[PDB]
Design a protein around this nucleic acid. Structure first.
Lengths: 95, 75, 97, 83, 83, 97
DNA sequence: ATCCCCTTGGCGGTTAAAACGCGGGGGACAGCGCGTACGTGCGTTTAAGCGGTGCTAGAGCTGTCTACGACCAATTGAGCGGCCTCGGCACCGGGATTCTCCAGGCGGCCAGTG
DNA sequence: CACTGGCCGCCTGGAGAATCCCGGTGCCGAGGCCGCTCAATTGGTCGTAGACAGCTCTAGCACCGCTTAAACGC
């Protein structure tokens, strides 16, 4: 066999069927989306690291990454992401 | 209809009489002051300039062709 | 009379068709030969993935597309429809090389 | 064995299509040689980074992974081949 | 306490002296107000980022470290204040 | 008659005098007023260290003088010596903001 | 140390890639002025700079405590690998529309004349 | 000086052709199904970082008196 090589194929397919059940997906577009997930994730992770060390914080919390989102994501995209993440963390803390 | 526009060009260039030649800016605003559709008759004033330079009634001051500035001849 | 189009119209047709085009615009094999050529300028007997040839191909063409869209911005700033090398040179200077 | 000119394999009509993508409508003859020159400069920088990766990988064949890594370092991050 | 019109605090001779340092010989009259505007939007980015850094810190006074830090994450790092 | 230099050479004197100088050309007090005003536009009752105001002052100094040297490059592109604000809009676009 | 696979090495047919010449035809550009617009020279003013004074906001350090989260063994399950079918699309054949450039008229305008 | 005539430059019209626009076909990647195993989680533990009160002091803020440099203007 082969070792399991990890990718974000299934979850982007899940949100794809969630928001457009009738549409399809291609392999090149899926590679683009995996690179997009990796790129945005590493940008936010890097800014979260910088916020962690500038405040001498040993941890990155929702405040840290939330601030990093306000830095990276501009404007209405930023506040919508704040709204989504706040709703998500309230649902998470509601267990 | 009316008179031909070359007469208007000659009176416009003879109205000023600067020590140097008159460029196209002062000429086109002299025609604007006299009253002329200078925006729609660029080709017409170009052929008028070619006719007046080529026939020899008017002499070019320093430019080449219709480019440059123009003065009146010796007589 | 054989039919002939005015200059720029075929050029603008190429503009529209190849902004519409999404494929690779360079012949593959001479680009592969060139990246191997530059490789043996650096390390001897070096090998490439075909996917790496694809990757340098698409990165190279997109980077050049960036330099040329800067070149149109510079050229219309220079009031020219015909670009010159100084447009690309100034774009390289401002881009932070 | 060795090759001395494949820079011209990125041909004059090929550079014409590339600038047709950028919207360039008239191209004088002087542009093309400098475009291959700056193509050599950029790809030289990228492959310098890439072979430095590759020699650090202790391998002898370049993958696209270190290619997109070098494009990340230079600041022209490429989508489609990450991971 | 409220301030209204500090865009004109950066005076026209200050703008002329700025462009003297940048090597500009002649400065047209339309330049001053829109350069005030682009200085404004540059500080909107920089101060929004730096103030966001401060409110991350639960501090109330803006510090120079956050100014240079918000500069540095925009690829505009400054030397001379603890960066 | 009092002596008068031609238009331009006093400007070049200011040029040469100011690359031989280092002094921050922006007045301290209205810059501090401006930074408090822009900060008050976002979040209220906000205090600035004098070091922060000064540091941001050479920051803005260098940012704009980089923009002016870039627009001088755009002006000598445009066969001009007097820059006009479309040079600045060009520089913003091709720098990527 | 190995293994097995995608690159390396070599081979045959073809037609688009290119490529170079002709020719039309679109283009940069100096330049001659002109419009005008800041550049520069002053005078005026006034507010920034400088110096001095009182307030206190919060920056920052210290102590407390507790809120929070990696680790780890374990259990399990949902996505990774792999195979496999199938219709959207990749490719193919025939028709409108742009589009566009070219053919013949309309009109302005210059040129000759009673 | 008006009247008339002819030619350059636009006005109007119109046909070939590139690309879009109507079907036809076969296929292989795309959507889907199955084994599984590596990883997602759960509970408990340890242990540790940071949130907050206090406080304090110091540097930032609030206020004032001159003075021409700088700002404003022509």
């Amino acid at each position: 066999k082969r070792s399991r090589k990890e990718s974000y194929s299934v979850y982007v397919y899940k949100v794809l069927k969630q928001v457009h059940p009738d549409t399809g997906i291609s392999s090149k577009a899926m590679g683009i989306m995996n690179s997009f997930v990796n790129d945005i994730f590493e940008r936010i992770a890097g800014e979260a690291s910088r916020l962690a060390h500038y405040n001498k914080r040993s941890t990155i919390t929702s405040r840290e990454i939330q601030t990093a989102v306000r830095l990276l994501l501009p404007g209405e995209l930023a506040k919508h992401a704040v709204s989504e993440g706040t709703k998500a963390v309230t649902k998470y803390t509601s267990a | 209809s009316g008179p031909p526009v070359s007469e208007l060009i000659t009176k416009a260039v003879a109205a000023s009489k600067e020590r140097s030649g008159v460029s196209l800016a002062a000429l086109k605003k002299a025609l604007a002051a006299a009253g002329y559709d200078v925006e729609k008759n660029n080709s017409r004033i170009k052929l008028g300039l070619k006719s007046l330079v080529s026939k020899g009634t008017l002499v070019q001051t320093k430019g080449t062709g219709a480019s440059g500035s123009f003065k009146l001849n010796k007589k | 009379k054989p039919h002939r189009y005015r200059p720029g119209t075929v050029a603008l047709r190429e503009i529209r068709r190849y902004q519409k085009s999404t494929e690779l615009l360079i012949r593959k094999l001479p680009f592969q030969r060139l990246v191997r050529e530059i490789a043996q300028d650096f390390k001897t007997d070096l090998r490439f993935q075909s996917s790496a040839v694809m990757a340098l191909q698409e990165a190279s063409e997109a980077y050049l597309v960036g330099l040329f869209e800067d070149t149109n911005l510079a050229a219309i700033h220079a009031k020219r429809v015909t670009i010159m090398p100084k447009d690309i040179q100034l774009a390289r200077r401002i881009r932070g090389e | 064995k060795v090759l001395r000119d494949n820079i011209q394999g990125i041909t004059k009509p090929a550079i014409r299509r590339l600038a047709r993508r950028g919207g360039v409508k008239r191209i004088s003859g002087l542009i093309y040689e400098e475009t291959r020159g700056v193509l050599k400069v950029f790809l030289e920088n990228v492959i310098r980074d890439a072979v430095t990766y590759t020699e650090h990988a202790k391998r002898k064949t370049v993958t696209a992974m270190d290619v997109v890594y070098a494009l990340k370092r230079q600041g022209r991050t490429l989508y489609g081949f990450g991971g």
